[model samples]
Target: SITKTELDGILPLVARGKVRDIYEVDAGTLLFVATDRISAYDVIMENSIPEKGILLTKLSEFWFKFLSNDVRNHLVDIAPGKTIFDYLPAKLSEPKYKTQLEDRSLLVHKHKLIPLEVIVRGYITGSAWKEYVKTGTVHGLKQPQGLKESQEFPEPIFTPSTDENISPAQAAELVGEDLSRRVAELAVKLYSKCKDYAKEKGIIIADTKFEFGIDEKTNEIILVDEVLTPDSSRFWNGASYKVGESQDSYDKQFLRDWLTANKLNGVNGVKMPQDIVDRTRAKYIEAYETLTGSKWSH
Candidate 1:
């Protein structure tokens, strides 16, 4: 929800899609502001993570610039004050938007978000276990038997989840082989392209999700959304990247594990105590600092 102050002059609030606040400025452009929200287990948590917006926005900026040669993105420019107009004067290839006010802000050309969570895993772990336990396959991509936790797959596997909110039984009915294979192929292609670049930086892009959409004008399918970041992907400490077991992550795994171990009733999805909240916040900052090879100045 937008604050009364943030809503000063923006029109009838186009979309409240998840945690992001989207306001339309014109037919060709809009402002996409990131919030301090964090979600897990398909549920959007109530508490906000400080600097979470900045971290995600910064990471997105890096990726958009890094991948610009491959495909165009919605990002126009970072805003000044409440908007960015200096960069908008020049003629642009297509519709472009601005990312100002918030750190990972985006001035984006509007498009329908493809309703699929495109997941690719280079190493087997996490939800794969739960899937394996339920059946003999991981996302219907058969894996070797007797594999231990955190074992790397012979190759990366792609799994696609639908954009539906339903129970486990209900969710299963929506997923099948056809849809799985299609999105899976796209996921693997994008992941390899991203992973190859990340490896050059001495970082392993363990697994990350990508969102893509077609350029209505050019009919080009371009990678969109936040990609190859700690929040959107499981970034492992490159030096210790291994095939077996969940390698110590370069993200907030420390905080997540601590919560699970202590049974601290709340850090995320539940009402966590103050101590846990403070500690978890510190851990998030630490993850960003340690993995990005830079200090968290903000």
Candidate 2:
């Protein structure tokens, strides 16, 4: 949530989850507004990244195109003749609200949300690597022996969670039989395609998180919420990728490292100094330019 006074009073407030603020556009539609509110170690910082939300909305929109051929998604395409302003309140067209809403807002179909934190990992890094090093397994399933940090797996794998780990059978146990099975197959394909596509641009999408929803009318799984943005995905520089050590990520790794160094990793309501802000912003801009093959307008 970007904290617009008018917007705050305007819509029925939805959950202010970690990253985005969701509002009901209508009974069946939602307007997801991305914010610069950054969180690491599950605790949100008191400060913002200055239009980091704009990068997220645009970056997610880029990968949504890559998934277009593979699955149904929740994005409501605005045709050429109109803009998001047309669908929103008439008063929002004024410059103040206009500037705030224009770049950061996303209009989507609100569906019956699936109760799972969908994720797919193409490489062993982050939590998976740490778990693998200790137990010789990831998500309670064994991997091949002697894999290094940040190394690609034989194939991309799917595991869904949030303080959460589950085997495929356990996924079946958690989300009922058919829905969980349907979830991973497409998620892995989506990850594989994007990972391959990004590799050509000298970027690596090590892993990404996804959210899904069910269309009650048809019982279809629509790819909902944010897609493959730096916020949800680990973007690494492919040229300098090293196997044994942690590689630089085109995201808030700078801030994360800073937080850890200061022993403030999980402490709440912290303000990021300007140096951290500047470097983090640069990392995000680099990712946007490299993967989209377009310059960062902001």
Candidate 3:
């Protein structure tokens, strides 16, 4: 079974992305692990969805196989012994310190991650709908007229957002239409590549986000971060296809529906109870099974 060992007490937190707990391992590497920690509205809530880490690890592993031809990635190999990272001095001799991995996963790698979030959408939904409704634009890309919500886009679109912490104005200043165009081109290419593969497997890669980095040694742009998991992408039941409405997805759709039903503060401030946690865990497993077409064992 895939797992993680929690560092006893407080392990040094290098950086916390929405779902990743990062631990520094020297200048060239960082230990990137996914926690059962789930987030909504971009906020990390009280509940941790179980097996989330393993799902993400496996999903990324699957897509990296397709994307490796076009971009680089962080997978060194599957052998745990060969997949070790340099340790921080604090972790030299602790045993109980490894509880964090009870239901999680990790990928240790050298960091220089290309400072961008490459998101590709194969259909219209989420912020794309909001953007289209407001200004007939989605991430600076002009959309066709009269497109309904959740409509399949004529083609996949790339919508790269800048690295963390730049304001809307600053982001516009940094990645203008020209650069967005370039990243979008590559993002669409990658999406198309993965989507084609997913289709053959009876899965539809509706939309997913990607991250990339450059290896200074090889001068290559490598894909980093997770790919096509429920957290990063939307997956629909390919057999029950629909055009203009939200379909049940292989994702946290249950939690989103739960918040909507109970009228909880769906933002960063809401407190989720145990019931929600259990339901969300079930949802993650459903996604894992649906996408890979197999049951999760551990």
Candidate 4:
């Protein structure tokens, strides 16, 4: 149960992003170590679900493999018989550090990052649905009239929010038109392709946010950061899918509902009840197994 990593004196710590503690392994690569620390409503829980970090790591790798042919990403390939430890300083392989870093860590190429959350929406839901029901607009762009909740869009649309919840026009002004357009096209395509794949395996990927970076050598947009995991997307069960109502999310419904029911939402230092934690982890495990067609052993 890792809350945060302590690799001091061995590797320099790069800032810890919500769940991942990052370290610069070398000039060209980064070690992304996902921790069991879980956050909801912008506040991290006092207790963590067991194996949460490992689950995210494996699920992200599954999506990465599925999307490999579509675009270049930041995951660096490690040869068989070798481990991430081989690339790290000798001290890190010792038990204390090794236990913390093993299965949950990934080696990735570092790139000049694009300061935008590239989101693609396949269905009318979440913030898009909320805005649509009220104003007929998503991220300030007008949508077709009379669309039901969670219905597939006329086509998947590129909806991005930068570093506010911003519109494409606003996004272009910040990241510039050309780079903006390219990343949008890529994100939409990537989402659409994965959506089709997951759909066949009985899951609906309602919408997801992708992060990207620039490969300086060629100025090409490389897909960086976590791919489509439950953390980055709203995944729903296909067999029970319906429109005109909020769909049950596969990730945190149990945890969220418990928080709201107890009026503990948005409160810091709240501990999750055992039942909620167990059920929540089960949902993540189910999502990963269903989409990837492999049982999760750990």
Name the best candidate (by TM-score). Answer: 4
Stretch of 10 with least lDDT, candidate 1: 90-99
Error of 2 at 34 (Å): 0.5
Candidate 3 lDDT over residue span 163-277, tens digit each = 3322233444665554445555677888888788777766677888877666667756666777777777877767666777777765566677777787764566666677877
Q: What are the lDDT figures for the candidates, one per model?
A: 0.61, 0.83, 0.66, 0.88
Which candidate number maximizes lDDT? 4
Tens digit per residue, CA lDDT, model 1, 242-290: 6655677665555566557776425445544556456656755655554
Candidate 2 — number of clashing residue pairs? Answer: 0
Residue-wise C-alpha lDDT for candidate 4, range 75-164, written one tens digit per residue = 888889988888888999999999999899999998898999898999998788889989999999998999999899989999898646
**Model 3: CA > 4 A from native:** 1-12, 77-94, 163-182, 200-203, 239-241, 267-275
- Candidate 3 Cα RMSD after full superposition onto the native fold (Å): 4.3
Q: Residue 191 deviation, candidate 1, in Å?
A: 1.6
Q: 3 or 4: which has the higher lDDT?
A: 4
Q: How do the candidates rank by lDDT, highest first?
A: 4, 2, 3, 1
Model 1: per-residue Cα lDDT at residue 180: 45
Q: Quick one: ranking by TM-score, best first?
A: 4, 2, 3, 1
Query: Worst lDDT window (10 residues) for model 2?
Result: 1-10
Tell me the lDDT of model 4 at 87.
81
**Alpha carbon lDDT at 87, candidate 1:** 35
Candidate 1 lands at a TM-score of: 0.71
Please, what is the TM-score per model? Answer: 0.71, 0.92, 0.78, 0.96
